[PDB]
Amino acid sequence: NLKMEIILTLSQGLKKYYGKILRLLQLTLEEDTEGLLEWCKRNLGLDCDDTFFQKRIEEFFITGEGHFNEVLQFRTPAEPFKSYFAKGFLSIDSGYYSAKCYSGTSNSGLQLINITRHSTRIVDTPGPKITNLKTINCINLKASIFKEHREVEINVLLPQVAVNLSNCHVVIKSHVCDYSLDIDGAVRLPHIYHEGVFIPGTYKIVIDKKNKLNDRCTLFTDCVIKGREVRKGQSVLRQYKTEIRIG
Residue number with CB closer to other proteins (46 or 213): 46
Helix axes 10-24, 50-58, angle to 10 degrees: 80
How many residues bind to other proteins according to rule CB under 8 A?
Answer: 54
Q: Which of 29, 34, 42, 186 binds other proteins (CB under 8 A)?
A: 42
- 101, 108, 107: which is closest to 192 by C-alpha? 101
Q: Does 57 bind other proteins (CB under 8 A)?
A: no
Q: Which of 29, 34, 110, 196 binds other proteins (CB under 8 A)?
A: 110
Q: CA 103 → CA 58, 89, 128, 202, 242, distances in Å?
A: 10, 5, 41, 16, 35
Q: Which of 54, 55, 93, 157 binds other proteins (CB under 8 A)?
A: 157
Amino acid letter, residue 57: I
- 131, 186, 191, 133: which is closest to 162 by C-alpha? 186
Q: Does 1 bind other proteins (CB under 8 A)?
A: yes
Q: Which of 29, 46, 183, 186 binds other proteins (CB under 8 A)?
A: 46
Contact between residue 102 and residue 175 where contact means Cβ atoms under 8 Å apart? yes
Amino acid letter, residue 16: K
Quote the CA–CA distance of 141 and 163 in Å, as a whole number. Answer: 10
Q: Does 186 bind other proteins (CB under 8 A)?
A: no
Q: Does 134 bind other proteins (CB under 8 A)?
A: yes
Q: Does 132 bind other proteins (CB under 8 A)?
A: no
Which parts of this chain interact with other proteins (CB under 8 A)? Answer: 1, 4-7, 9-10, 38, 41-43, 45-46, 79-80, 105-114, 118, 120, 134, 136-137, 139, 142-147, 155, 157-160, 201-202, 224-226, 228, 232-237
